[PDB]
RNA sequence: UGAAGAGUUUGAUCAUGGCUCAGAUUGAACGCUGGCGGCAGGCCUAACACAUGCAAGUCGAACGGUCCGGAAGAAGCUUUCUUUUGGACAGUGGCGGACGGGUGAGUAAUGUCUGGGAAACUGCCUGAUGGAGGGGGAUAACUACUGGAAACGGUAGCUAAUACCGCAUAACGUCGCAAGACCAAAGAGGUUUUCUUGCCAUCGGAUGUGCCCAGAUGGGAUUAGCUAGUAGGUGGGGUAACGGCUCACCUAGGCGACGAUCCCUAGCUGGUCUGAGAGGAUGACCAGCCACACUGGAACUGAGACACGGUCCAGACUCCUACGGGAGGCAGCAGUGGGGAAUAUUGCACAAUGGGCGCAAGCCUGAUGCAGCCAUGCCGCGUGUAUGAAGAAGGCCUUCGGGUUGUAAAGUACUUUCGCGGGGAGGAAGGGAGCGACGAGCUCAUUGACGUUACCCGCGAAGUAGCACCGGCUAACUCCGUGCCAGCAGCCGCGGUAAUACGGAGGGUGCAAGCGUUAAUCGGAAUUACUGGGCGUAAAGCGCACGCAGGCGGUUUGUUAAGUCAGAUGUGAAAUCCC
């Protein structure tokens, strides 16, 4: 599955964070609601940095927390 | 009720009577019964006649009396020691008397 | 293990089985896989006994489905 | 029948399978102590008298498939290093 | 094709607002009233305590004895005794008990519901490939002895297998490097040189599962900051497998008003009922899943139960006891007692269907198939049905003229109950036997209800009946008695000499054992209103400014297109809702 979002922090090594963000109506009244998740995604080359708005895609669990890798960088920089 | 049952059983404590409110004047009679549910409420005593002493327990219906305020409960006769009314020719279905032969 | 046996719609005065394809574990009446034909015991309600659909069951014959010893006897009638 | 000896049986069964692993811990952890130390040629010998043992007890339900192969690879992991 | 509420706050009116009434359902009942027949259904209250019986066995084509039965011998007869053989119990050996059946406490959680993913497994069964050479070892039964009241136990001796182990062949598979080395396996039975049953290893199929993920899943913040393995990294340990799941070291984060944490409640779902729809409530019967069997905890053996008739430990109870020490636990079926307003035969039986084991024969199976008790409900008949005199009696009503009940209120016949006699169903045929290789197939026989109900035919007596209510809502009237007196009442009220609402009587309405009554669930309420609403005076705008997040926001162009929309495909749990 390809995910777009945002570099919201490029603190930890070969690790950044994804912050993808969605619109879907409400169950009941019907009206969008935004909702936001965080995903660790692996970045060996530590090529992404923070304001990057990069894909994310599926691939084999790195780790517990990390189950997504960098595929490629839509943009430049947008903090 | 509590448990919402239909009918609940309970020892009385005393078998008083109340009288009327400003409408009326009599003297009807009461008992303040011990339902199981854990509650002290009191019950009326339909009948021209009852025997209903200390140690009665009687089963209770559920009836707001208009002239009694706070009997919101009715004694169920011809259950339990409650002997149902004797000569009742009318009301048999309430109160509980046999068909006489 | 799939087998190969009788469903009994059994109701007051109204015998009819449907010979269907399930696993040997779902109950008599249970969710079965899929239905080759039918069977009337009386044979009243429609003049045609029995549908055994042989292609179908020649299908599930040999996929490991092994029928029961009443259901073979409906079965080898064709 | 005597549903003891299914019971008897069971107990003795883990003595065994007990024993087979101490052969194990015992000759692997000599392979791996010989290559510390450098001897090559007592080492592998070692190493040749615990491959056998951990597939034996492959055959049989004491250390099955998986983690038979697994001991193997270990093994011969960490003899290849210290030597 | 789908939408008509009413009563009560005023002296009167409108508005607001809460309560209340008839509806459907519930594994019920009490009060008084009983005939029958089909179908269906039954502790919804104490997981309270339980007498008694039952709830899994089956194999001698695994092996020695005992019990039961048959046949043939040594004998003149008897005693005694020998051989062969059938079934099975005791034992040894194999398989099964984690399937089915019961209950819902516990449980808010991927537990479940819906769609996917993969770091997996799968006895018996099915398809395909290859193989089964040689050898060694162990423990019971049995025999002898001893201990104990019993349970049961100790020692010595003999002995077999499809019980265990060592070595080869390698179809293959496994492991390092890269493109090398290592590792398997028990027969038996016969129509025995031909098959049958079974085994060893590998791949696949079928089917059933472990695990992970997105979304969805009640009430309260008078429950808010919380958290130390707690969040992440490396390595290791552990498991069938991912994972701090567990350990060492390092980093220091992680989560929260899209409300974590805590507390309360409840098996969940599909569904059930209701409603025009939306929605609400519920989820009892049946089907799927989950969890639980003296209370609590834990582990082993296994494909699978952490496992009711398996085991270990802690606690309580009951029973047995020469008290030394043991035996159990029906929230399994029936049933008992207690509780309660209250809910049943400690009945009959296996042929059918289905299930377990066996080649088969055959065995097991209160799973189930039926009967009994109780109108608890529904369908064709509660207090009657049909017939019947311009109608002389009795009950009922009455303006006292009359009218009404009109088998007569008598009888008679009945739908035709009940009851008796006969026949006796499946809405299912085999097991067995004959032909055929006791295989397929064909043929034939026995057994009927479940160790006799239903229905059909015949005979045949009329063969009970009561309660509630009659002011209004509620359909159904006066006289008499009493007299704010006694009493009635859900609400509005009624009764002080004409009371249809008090008690009685005549009459009438309802029910036609139902109808009333009591209790419980849903909507009407557009009274939270998304569809359906309001805030000057009726309940209701923050005192103001400003400002964060958020919401909303002018115009033009291009890319992406995530949202949104469209086609196809997979799943659409099953069941149901809807038709």
Same mark, same amino acid.
């Given at each position: 599955?390809?995910?777009?979002?945002?570099?919201?922090?490029?603190?930890?090594?070969? $690790?950044?964070?994804?912050?993808?963000?969605?619109? #879907?109506?409400?169950?009941?009244?019907?009206?969008?609601?935004?909702?936001?998740?965080?995903?660790?995604?692996?970045?060996?080359?530590?090529?992404?940095?923070?304001?990057? #708005?990069?894909?994310?895609?599926?691939?084999?669990?790195? $780790?517990?927390?990390?189950?997504?890798?960098?595929?490629?960088?839509?943009?430049?920089?947008?903090? | 009720?509590? =448990?919402?049952?239909?009918?609940?059983?309970?020892?009385?404590?005393?078998?008083?009577?109340?009288?009327?409110?400003?409408?009326?004047?009599?003297?009807?009679?009461?008992?303040?019964?011990?339902?199981?549910?854990?509650? =002290?409420?009191?019950?009326?005593?339909?009948? =021209?006649?009852?025997?209903?002493? =200390?140690?009665?327990?009687?089963?209770?219906?559920?009836?707001?009396?208009?002239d009694l305020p706070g009997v919101r409960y009715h004694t169920v006769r011809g259950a339990l020691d409650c002997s149902g009314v004797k000569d009742r020719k009318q009301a048999r279905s309430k109160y509980g008397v046999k068909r006489p032969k | 293990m799939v087998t190969i046996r009788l469903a009994r719609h059994?109701? %007051? %005065?109204?015998?009819?089985? !449907?010979?269907?394809?399930?696993?040997?574990?779902?109950?008599?009446?249970?969710?079965?896989?899929?239905?080759?034909?039918?069977?009337?015991? /009386?044979?009243?309600?429609?003049?045609? &006994?029995?549908? +055994?659909? +042989?292609?179908? /069951?020649?299908?599930?014959? &040999? !996929? &490991?489905?092994? /029928?029961?010893?009443?259901?073979?006897? +409906?079965?080898?009638?064709? | @029948?005597?549903?003891?000896?299914?019971?008897?049986?069971?107990?003795?069964?883990?003595?065994?399978?007990?024993?087979?692993?101490?052969?194990?811990?015992?000759?692997?952890?000599?392979?791996?102590?010989?290559?510390?130390?450098?001897?090559?040629?007592?080492?592998? @010998?070692?190493?040749?008298?615990?491959?056998?043992?951990?597939?034996?007890?492959?055959?049989?339900?004491?250390?099955?498939?998986? @983690?038979?192969?697994?001991?193997?690879?270990?093994?011969?992991?960490?003899?290849?290093?210290?030597?």
């Open positions: 599955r390809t995910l777009q979002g945002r570099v919201v922090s490029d603190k930890m090594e070969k $690790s950044i964070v994804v912050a993808i963000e969605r619109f #879907v109506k409400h169950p009941i009244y019907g009206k969008f609601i935004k909702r936001t998740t965080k995903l660790h995604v692996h970045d060996e080359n530590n090529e992404c940095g923070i304001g990057d #708005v990069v894909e994310i895609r599926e691939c084999r669990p790195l $780790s517990k927390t990390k189950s997504w890798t960098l595929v490629r960088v839509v943009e430049k920089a947008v903090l | 009720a509590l =448990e919402a049952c239909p009918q609940k059983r309970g020892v009385c404590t005393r078998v008083y009577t109340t009288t009327p409110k400003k409408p009326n004047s009599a003297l009807r009679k009461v008992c303040r019964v011990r339902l199981t549910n854990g509650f =002290e409420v009191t019950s009326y005593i339909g009948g =021209e006649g009852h025997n209903l002493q =200390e140690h009665s327990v009687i089963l209770i219906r559920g009836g707001r009396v208009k | 059994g109701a %007051k %005065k109204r015998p009819f089985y !449907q010979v269907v394809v399930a696993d040997s574990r779902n109950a008599r009446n249970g969710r079965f896989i899929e239905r080759v034909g039918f069977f009337n015991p /009386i044979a009243s309600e429609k003049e045609e &006994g029995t549908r +055994l659909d +042989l292609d179908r /069951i020649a299908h599930w014959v &040999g !996929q &490991g489905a092994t /029928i029961s010893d009443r259901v073979a006897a +409906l079965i080898k009638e064709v | @029948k005597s549903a003891k000896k299914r019971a008897i049986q069971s107990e003795k069964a883990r003595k065994h399978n007990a024993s087979r692993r101490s052969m194990m811990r015992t000759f692997i952890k000599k392979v791996y102590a010989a290559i510390e130390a450098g001897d090559k040629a007592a080492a592998q @010998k070692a190493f040749n008298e615990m491959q056998p043992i951990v597939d034996r007890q492959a055959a049989k339900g004491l250390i099955h498939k998986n @983690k038979a192969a697994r001991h193997k690879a270990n093994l011969t992991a960490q003899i290849n290093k210290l030597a």
